[PDB]
Amino acid sequence: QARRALLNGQPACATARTLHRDFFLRAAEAPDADALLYRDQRVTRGELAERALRIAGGLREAGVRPGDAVEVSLPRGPQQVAAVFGVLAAGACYVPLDIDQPPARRRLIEEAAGVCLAITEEDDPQALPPRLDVQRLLRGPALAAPVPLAPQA
Amino acid sequence: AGIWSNLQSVDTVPPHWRSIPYGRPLPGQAYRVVDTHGRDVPDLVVGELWIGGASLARGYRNDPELSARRFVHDAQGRWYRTGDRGRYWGDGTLEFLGRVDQQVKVRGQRIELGEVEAALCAQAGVESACAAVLGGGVASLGAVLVPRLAPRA
Amino acid sequence: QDRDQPFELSSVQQAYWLGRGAGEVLGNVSCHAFLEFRTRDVDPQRLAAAAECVRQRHPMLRARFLDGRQQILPTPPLSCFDLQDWRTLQVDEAERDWQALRDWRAHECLAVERGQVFLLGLVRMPGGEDRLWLSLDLLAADVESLRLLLAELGVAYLAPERLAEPPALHFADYLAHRAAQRAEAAARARDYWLERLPRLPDAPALPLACAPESIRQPRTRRLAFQLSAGESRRLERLAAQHGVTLSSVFGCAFALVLARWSESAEFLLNVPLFDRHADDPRIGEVIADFTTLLLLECRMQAGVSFAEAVKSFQRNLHGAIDHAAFPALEVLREARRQGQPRSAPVVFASNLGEEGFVPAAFRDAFGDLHDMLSQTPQVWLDHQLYRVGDGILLAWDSVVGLFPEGLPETMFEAYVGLLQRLCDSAWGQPADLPLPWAQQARRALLNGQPACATARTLHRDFFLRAAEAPDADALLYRDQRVTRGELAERALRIAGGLREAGVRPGDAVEVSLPRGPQQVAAVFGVLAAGACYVPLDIDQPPARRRLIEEAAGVCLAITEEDDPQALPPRLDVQRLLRGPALAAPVPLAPQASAYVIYTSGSTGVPKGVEVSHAAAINTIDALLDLLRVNASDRLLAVSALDFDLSVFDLFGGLGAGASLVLPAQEQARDAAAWAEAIQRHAVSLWNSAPALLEMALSLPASQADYRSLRAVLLSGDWVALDLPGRLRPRCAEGCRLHVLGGATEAGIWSNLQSVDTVPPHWRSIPYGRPLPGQAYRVVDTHGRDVPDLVVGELWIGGASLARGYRNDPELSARRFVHDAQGRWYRTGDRGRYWGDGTLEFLGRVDQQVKVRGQRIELGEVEAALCAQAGVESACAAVLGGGVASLGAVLVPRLAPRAEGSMDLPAAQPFAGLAEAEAVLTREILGALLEAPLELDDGLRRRWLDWLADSAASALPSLDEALRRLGWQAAGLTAMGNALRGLLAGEQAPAALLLDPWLAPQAVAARLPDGREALARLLEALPTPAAGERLRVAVLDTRAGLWLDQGMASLLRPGLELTLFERSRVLLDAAATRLPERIVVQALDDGLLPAEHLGRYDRVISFAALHAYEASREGLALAAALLRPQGRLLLVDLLCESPLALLGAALLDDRPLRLAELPSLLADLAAAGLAPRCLWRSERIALVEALAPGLGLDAAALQAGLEQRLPQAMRPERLWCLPSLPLNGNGKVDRRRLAESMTRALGAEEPLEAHEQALAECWEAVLKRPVRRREASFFSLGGDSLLATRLLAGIRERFGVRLGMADFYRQPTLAGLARHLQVQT
Ligand SMILES: *P(=O)(O)OCC(C)(C)[C@@H](O)C(=O)NCCC(=O)NCCSC(=O)[C@H]1CSC(c2ccccc2O)=N1
Ligand SMILES: [N][C]([C][S])C(=O)O=P([O])([O])O[C][C]1O[C](N2[C]=NC3=C2N=[C]N=C3[N])[C]([O])[C]1[O]
Ligand SMILES: [Mg+2]
């Protein structure tokens, strides 16, 4: 029990904060740095933070709000990463699914998650959750900052 | 438990490892290993890995009853009750020993065989199903069906 | 009710109003809500018009608060709208100005005395942001009424034409209705609450960094957490499933946090509920204060499901709404009127109105609530809730600096953690919170510390150290030293002697030997026999010894005597040393019992703590490996053998081959003997209770040089904060003090706070980290761990626990307990972790008592007495008697000052006097020997020898003896007759000490020119020359007959006299015979009442300073009793009266107590008294000596205790001592102090003009007749409401500006007169 209380007792080694906080800091600190590299093109932290904050503004415009949840269902690539940061920066909890996740199973998850919205390249405001094009959320106005989430959201 | 809960560094494998163990718990989070009655098992004894401390998920998104079955509370705080089996070796390392239950790994991903079986019972015409990950180098997921017969006199 | 005339405050408005009081407990603040809101732009003139429009709509926004009543203005004098247009400024200067404006108007006491209960305002930031904000004093309004003010502002900003109707129901008509309408319900609930006041729980016993009385400027710090839509939905649907109002969910979860953070899970929390019930539906639009305050006595159960806990909280909450018909404030008043300081300074304001807190008409006009602040007075933790968005803003308006830093943060993080644990998981789960993981993670490291020990039999290493180096020093004694080989072969001789006597592995053996090498050889011999040693003091009384022999089930006793026929077979250690040697120690597996150490058998059946070798050697290694103990070290065994510290001295010290300097049994508490032992044998290690090292350090650095002392261990009792500071220059360079924690039930110790010096945040030296291999918990009464900073019971765990109480398994299951965390000794120490993982110990659990209306922190009373000028040390206890009084005790430090230079007037005595007393000694020896059977045979033979030895064979004289003595042959006859009659009654000591012819100091007050000694002692009492009042006292009064013999020299005009003795029956005679101008008071059970400190300009001692257990004892008693510049007047026996020596032989008390003139004057100058010797040569030597500024006086103590303690822990009686008495096991004897005070315990009109003119003020305000001064205002019938009318009454009656906090510390009539006496 002594050994195990040491190994369990290992101190927090963390600063409790909103999960996105640090990326938006790394972006504000070096907007030009390569955040993403993808299919032989690249995205800066500034570009990604803006793309995310535009998605966030599009999500607050689409009725998403702090600790409410948002499905993200995008092919693997920068728009996916921008969307999860944009969900988190809208204050929301992202509910990732593969775009390959099949429709009846996706409906079990969309039903069980109580999900406010889904981000999917498809626009369909009449889906089980309202379903949204990330490319349209990328036309959204940028939020000037991520929404202040307390660390436990 | 959050993205991980242990770290075995591996500069080399000492030959007595039957598997690469779960190492020390990651900082700020913890492991118990318990008897089926919730008390800690002694070192080298196999029991159920309870992950604990600050890294844990808050629960399942809209399943409070399964949350209470997993995210349990004890005189030692809050614990995820994983259903992984394992043992603390005498040096306080945590050998993970696979799972006792219907949950298995396919091409790295987590699958509940109860999910595969239920997705087969969701077939009109299946009375019940079994699923298992199989032997051979393919490591394939297999399943087995009982059809429902639509009786008459 | 006339709509602009003064009308009564609602009860809960009085709670805010009286909380504005600069002298009220955590008062001086508004009870305002500050709200803050954001938008890019708003028209400031629309706002200015809107704010003034809502004032002229609602009476209560324009209500003035004065004289504890409210009165409504047609419009207020002071500005409605604090516009601050900064659209031009630099952004960050505007932000700093906003933060100043924010901190100001969010902490602001609004001018409610000028009707400014409502104030709107607006910074216009140059960043393009109009931050509308709103300071509403809740004297106007409920929070549920504040959202209606927002509704009115939202409309009045956007479309003021739609403000269709100003709500016609005036708040005075609502009160004039409500206060009459409630009447039966209020009485019905008053009867409920009155009968519950003794049974009400406390405020939540949370960790406070500051006393609430010790801050005048309570800034609220808000903590907040927005539960989302989804978390709100999950709580709302789960609240529905479990059948509870959503306020009950949040209130239950809050009360579970406060329970987990309280010392006890039962407390009051003030629930402001929303009594917006009225006949007019427009009450739903009136802005006045519809708060009603519910004193929810929550009692939160542990380990139940949250589903049970929340239904319980709801049932309590709902049922208590009916009892809130008599308002919580009047319950808190009636508690004060019943002598209980109860409060609900923690608050649960569930403003959960389903629309969103900020109403939609306002959410259109400005963004939903950005931030907010309370300033609720007299409330530590104002928890509120708001629907925000469609989510729920949790808010905790904690107070800045009141809680520890990071505590409202962590406690609130646990509350949010709980509420998400309620969202995402079913309420069938335990209502017990987790410890917030960071706290538990640290404590898992502290408890996780590896064994750092090898499991082995406790004696093992000593027998190795002997086989390695047999000629090395093991023990150093009175003169001689025993080597390891000698000690090992002596131990193994005793071991074989014990095997032969039938003792065998783990069977228990008493070791009652005087401290010395044979005692050590006996414990190592018992342990080498494989047996378990049961050490006892040889001076322990026989009845207690039989209980311990019985209770240990003791196989055998080693006792320096053979009696194989006793309760156990009892053996002489010298015969056991004549026994055969064992070849080797009998093999024990380490888990076997090593010793059983016994507490005092005054506790009923003696608790004997059986410790295994594994446990003992674990603690020992865990300390040897920290002390780096080595073969050159030399410990001092000041620890008695029945005090478990000796186990480290023995099996630790000699396990490392470090030799023991042993005090002998006559040196068992002697600091001078220890000091020489350190200075002589170059002692490198020390180990004791702090009261022993305090006693060692009480000797000067020149008299007692400890600079050999490489490291110091202190244990078992509170270590004073100055003590490391006193110790650093005394011990070796690199002082290495360690203070060590925990009871014998955890082996010798369980903690180590290393001390270089005290960091200034300590209030006692804490328990440190647990020692290696063992562990601590602090637990709630339910056995769950309490959080950091939270006081609970200390539990000790792991590889050092005692096996149990030796033959009480039933108590062992109560005091040792078992969890998923392993096995724990449940100590009954209070204490708390700190954030850094240090473990503050806070006294035994009985060192708190729920005395008659409050929990007393007796450790805090001791800490506050130690802060007095000139105090060495203090104790506090709670007593017997019909009051069950608080009691406390002091000691002065005496300012040692080397004034002792002298000459002795030797010219008056001659040898024919000592011959006269030798003759009279022979005659009265011979006179008792006319009936020689009144003695025992030992005294008979002594007396028959002294009939020649104390007589003409040494100091012969003729009948001239009689004329030297002053008593003639009539007196010789009267002595012989009295002595035979008294001893045919056998009435020594008691009647011998009552007798004029025979009492030892009284015969010394005649025979040795004793009346002439007494005369020249009493002479120069200056009052019949000076014509001025003089206070005299006597230390050694006994029967008063020796004083009566001097009394013609004592009855001086202006002389006041007080008479003292450490005995009751003798003072009854003194009090019988001496006139009513002379006072008599016992030092009952050794204890001086504090009313006498610093009071006496003169103090008398007669032929009895040796009758104290030190010179330093009776001297320190004298010095404390003396007024500064006052004179001790002493005759000391540099030789006894030969008849007082018969007297002492009939007490059978040793003549070795007596001391020389330099020996007296050295200790007396160390007691600070500056001396002259004066008289009677080498016999009955007169000394007088002058007192320094010791500062102790009951007046000065009252002023210091008024400066440092609340009225609920006044030292209800107060006493003093020359030093605190000591346990056999080293501690300050808090039981003897408690019993002694319990023995020493044993209305009238106003008579000052200020008391009488105050009685007129109390009688005017309270109506009831103020005939008695001794009453306290609240106990008589006062309230904080009535304290305003009393202050204003004093401001009419006398004109003085009353400090209301000082009046709350001074609630009795003369205590109130204090501020009038000083014309404040
Ligand atoms: P006195 O006549 O009061 O008699 C003596 C006693 C001992 C009773 C006196 O010293 C005392 O304790 N007075 C009562 C103090 C008290 O109870 N204070 C708290 C009243 S509570 C209240 O309803 C607050 C808390 S929640 C709410 C609020 C919400 C939003 C924004 C601000 C505030 O304050 N109001
Ligand atoms: N010696 C001892 C043990 S160490 C004994 O014996 O006694 P007791 O009672 O049991 O114990 C003591 C008491 O107190 C406490 N402590 C310890 N340590 C200390 C203390 N206090 C204070 N400080 C310190 N350090 C214990 O636990 C008990 O209660
Ligand atoms: Mg004890």
Numbering used by the authors:
A (entry chain B): 538 to 690
B (entry chain B): 844 to 996
C (entry chain A): 99 to 1340, 1348 to 1425
How did the manuscript describe this experimental structure?
In conformation 3, the PCP domain of chain A binds at the acceptor site of the Cy domain, with the hydroxyphenylthiazolinyl-pPant ligand observed, representing the post-condensation state. The A domain (complexed with Cys-AMP and Mg2+ ligands) adopts the adenylate-forming conformation. Intriguingly, in the PCP post-condensation conformation, in which ArCP departs from the Cy domain, the tunnel adopts a similar conformation previously observed with both EpoB and BmdB. Similarly, the “Y” tunnel of PchE Cy is truncated at the side of ArCP by the residue F372.
PchD activates salicylate, PchE and PchF successively integrate two l-cysteines into the growing peptide to form two thiazoline rings, and PchG then reduces the second thiazoline ring to thiazolidine before the release of mature pyochelin.
